[PDB]
């Protein structure tokens, strides 16, 4: 016979417009509703530069995934 | 003197650093011959040493007027062209040898030293060397870029494995590992980054599940982190730490529950176990195949284990996403005096063997309903030498700290990635054509293509960069213009 | 503490201050022995992790977990007396065998007042640069000799130079007469 | 005899 002394198990947390201002993803910015370009970040979300400018000026985390927002500068 | 130098030396450089019809300059040929003969020019009494001396003094004299200019720039671009030709020859020659990465690193070391000996230590020539290597890696086919990236990922994984597992040969190999990283880091900012990162994730996964996140993985990342475009590996590492924090919180939550129970009972009156640790992984960062899942957890696992798993799932639900359980993991078992270090499936089989004295494979095949290939992989160590299971499919005991884990199987490139890249390319071409002379800001175009997909933003950006290099599209700078 | 009061920072500060105060009210010889034991533990764990293959991962994980209590020594004379023994043991570790030393120093860095341990690693880097310069000098000299003339199977030796500011070497370990105890090619 | 393949010497400066 065998006996278990320890163990480790694994599982995944299985579960798209500009959520922060809720306008359509490709549409314009409600605050100004037309000069906001879209912004991308390392955490792979797309938000309005207006939305993000304000929000970041308030708080310094990604509002969608709880990580320090980093303006994506690859490929640029 | 300013007049004399600007008159005599300058057009001489501007002439000798001009490509011929074949594309070769005089100074280019000179440097090429130097690099070719450097190996055999180590005899103090030989013609080759004299050749090296002549070339060395000529170059030092030509650049000695320096501390842009017109003497620096031309010689710089010539050094660039010669490094590019050399590296491209090498890459075409050996992209399938089982010693490719080490020869690549030897090349980088030898060419950097040659540059320092020739032109002295100066800043811009190192940047020339880097740009040359880059341009050479870009002048390649897609299948070959894929194979090269896979070779890099395998090299890192194999070095870390050897250094951690082995003894003094390890610590020897490890300083070398640190040396060889600076050549690799030239990959950043190129297209190859995405495929290299994809390949790196796939080995870092198994390495983290075979051993906790050691110093080695964090150190390698603190060297080469800015190469990975989306920063996936850092997120896997951070995930392990977040999980330990969650373990702390679960302990506290248990205490609070028990306190409430004690209080209620106290008002009414007033009126030898297996340790288990859980790990949650975000599916945005780990490559967990759908083949690796648990579906009827009670059926395939013992009772108390499932009770603990249910309790933890209850906590995770109450704290806030459901928990999809997997067969990935590692366990330590006791069987006689010896200790066993096995994976999850191995522990499952060996625990099923706690009652019966012989196992027929078809029973377990029906029970698990998992891929029989992974069960074969699990059994091969277990049926191998020093294997507490003997195969006859009949399983029976044959009758030191044993480590029985299925070793890594490096993905052998034969193709799906090429299909994905080509499809993204044509979709982006259609999108650019539809917008005409207006085009878009790049981020808007990424949004459009991602919407049309129903893949990562970085993948689309990689396709965009490859197209730009091909010259189909040009940059206006926020917006991009097709041509 | 986390069970009794929940997650709060002020109680953690109280815990650290309590450990510090407990350490302080001790006789000198006890403090010296304690510092020596701490340094010996760190050295033993690192050396075992480097030589031991199969359980070395466990040792290294335990070391990273256990580093946190030792940070209490920052802001005491124990830091001064502990830097000394860390110097003595790290010298031998560096000579005999690295890359984990920097990792350890990245989190135990504040404890050392005079920062000598980092100075040792800086010294190693300087020695490497010096070797490169030496090679370039040799090539230059050969070039001058060839110009003057034309104007008309071996052991691999690497040399490491140490500074006396931040390196403990006992003068009993010196070598005085090289030709008396060395072959001729090495001496050359 | 006994053959050397590599040596590392150590010096201080005074």
Span between N and C termini of chain B? 49 Å
Helix-residue proportion of chain A = 10-25%
Largest sheet of chain B: 3 strands, mixed
Which chains make the largest contact? A-B, 28 and 59 residues
Gross morphology of chain A is elongated
Rg of chain B, Cα atoms, Å = 30 Å
Organism (chain C): Homo sapiens
Family (chain C): Belongs to the cullin family.
Protein name (chain C): Cullin-9
Subcellular location (chain C): Cytoplasm
What can you tell me about this protein's structure?
This is part of a larger assembly, with two copies of chain A and two copies of chain B. Chain A is α+β, with helices and mostly antiparallel strands. Chain A has one domain: Herpes Virus-1, CATH 3.30.40. Chain A has one helix and four strands; from the N terminus they run E-E-E-E-H. A two-stranded antiparallel ribbon of chain A has the order 3-4. In chain A, a hairpin with a 5-residue loop joins strand 3 and strand 4. Chain A starts with a strand and ends in an 18-residue tail after the last helix. By secondary structure, chain B is mainly alpha-helical. In chain B, 64% of the residues lie in helices and 8% in strands. Chain B has 20 helices and eleven strands. In chain B, the strands form three sheets. Chain B has a three-stranded mixed beta sheet with strand order 3-4-8. A three-stranded antiparallel beta sheet of chain B has the order 5-7-6. A three-stranded antiparallel beta sheet of chain B has the order 9-11-10. In chain B, a hairpin with a 2-residue loop joins strand 6 and strand 7. In chain B, helix 2 crosses helix 3 and helix 7 runs antiparallel to helix 8. The longest helix of chain B has 39 residues. The radius of gyration of chain B is 30 Å and the shape is elongated. Chain B starts with a helix and ends with a strand. In chain B, 25% of the residues are buried. Chains in contact: A-B, B-C, C-D. At the C-D interface, strand 1 of C face strand 1 of D.
């Amino acid at each position: 016979r065998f006996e278990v002394k320890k163990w480790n198990a694994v599982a995944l947390w299985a579960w798209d417009n500009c959520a922060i201002c809720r306008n359509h993803i490709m549409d314009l910015c409600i605050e100004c509703q037309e000069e906001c370009t879209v912004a991308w970040g390392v955490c792979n979300h797309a938000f309005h530069f207006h939305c993000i400018s304000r929000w970041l000026k308030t708080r310094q985390v990604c509002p969608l995934d709880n990580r320090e927002w980093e303006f994506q500068k690859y490929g640029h | 003197g300013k007049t004399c130098w600007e008159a005599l030396v300058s057009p001489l450089v501007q002439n000798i650093t001009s490509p011929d019809a074949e594309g070769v300059s005089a100074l280019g040929w000179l440097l090429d011959q130097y690099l070719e003969q450097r190996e055999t020019s180590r005899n103090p009494l030989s013609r080759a040493a004299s050749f090296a001396s002549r070339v060395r003094r000529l170059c030092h004299l030509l650049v000695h007027v320096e501390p842009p200019s017109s003497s620096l720039r031309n010689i710089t671009q010539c050094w660039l062209s010669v490094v590019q030709e050399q590296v491209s020859r090498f890459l075409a020659a050996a992209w399938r040898a089982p010693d490719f990465v080490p020869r690549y690193c030897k090349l980088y070391e030898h060419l950097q030293r040659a540059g320092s000996e020739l032109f002295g230590p100066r800043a811009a020539f190192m940047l020339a060397l880097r740009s040359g290597f880059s341009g050479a890696l870009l002048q390649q086919s897609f299948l070959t870029a894929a194979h090269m990236s896979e070779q890099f990922a395998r090299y890192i994984d194999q070095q870390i494995q050897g250094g951690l597992i082995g003894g003094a040969p390890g610590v020897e190999m490890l300083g070398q590992l640190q040396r060889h990283l600076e050549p690799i880091m030239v990959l950043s900012g190129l297209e190859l980054a995405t495929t290299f990162e994809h390949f790196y994730q796939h080995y870092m996964a198994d390495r983290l599940l075979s051993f906790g996140s050691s110093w080695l993985e964090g150190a390698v990342l603190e060297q080469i982190g800015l190469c990975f475009p989306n920063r996936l590996p850092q997120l896997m590492l951070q995930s392990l730490s977040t999980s330990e924090e969650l373990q702390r919180q679960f302990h506290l939550f248990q205490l609070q529950r028990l306190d409430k129970l004690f209080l209620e009972q106290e008002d009414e009156e007033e009126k030898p176990s297996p340790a288990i640790s859980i790990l949650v992984l975000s599916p945005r960062c780990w490559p967990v195949s759908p083949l690796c899942y648990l579906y009827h957890p009670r059926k395939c696992l013992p009772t108390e284990f499932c009770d603990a798993l249910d309790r933890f799932s209850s906590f995770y639900s109450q704290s806030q996403r459901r928990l999809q359980w997997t067969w990935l993991g590692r366990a330590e078992l006791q069987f006689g005096k010896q200790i066993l270090h096995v994976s999850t499936v191995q522990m499952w089989l060996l625990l099923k063997f706690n009652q019966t004295e012989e196992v027929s494979v078809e029973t377990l095949l029906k029970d698990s309903d998992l891929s029989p290939e992974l069960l074969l992989q699990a059994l091969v160590p277990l049926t191998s030498g020093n294997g507490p299971l003997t195969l006859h499919g009949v399983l029976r005991l044959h009758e030191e700290a044993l480590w029985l884990i299925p070793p890594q199987a490096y993905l052998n490139v034969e193709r799906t990635l090429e299909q994905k890249r080509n499809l993204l390319s044509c979709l982006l071409v259609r999108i650019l054509k539809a917008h005409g002379e207006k085009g878009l800001h790049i981020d808007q175009l990424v949004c459009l293509v991602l919407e049309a997909w129903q893949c990562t933003s970085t993948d689309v950006l990689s396709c965009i960069l490859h197209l730009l290099g091909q010259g189909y599209v040009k940059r206006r700078p926020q917006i991009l213009m097709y041509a």
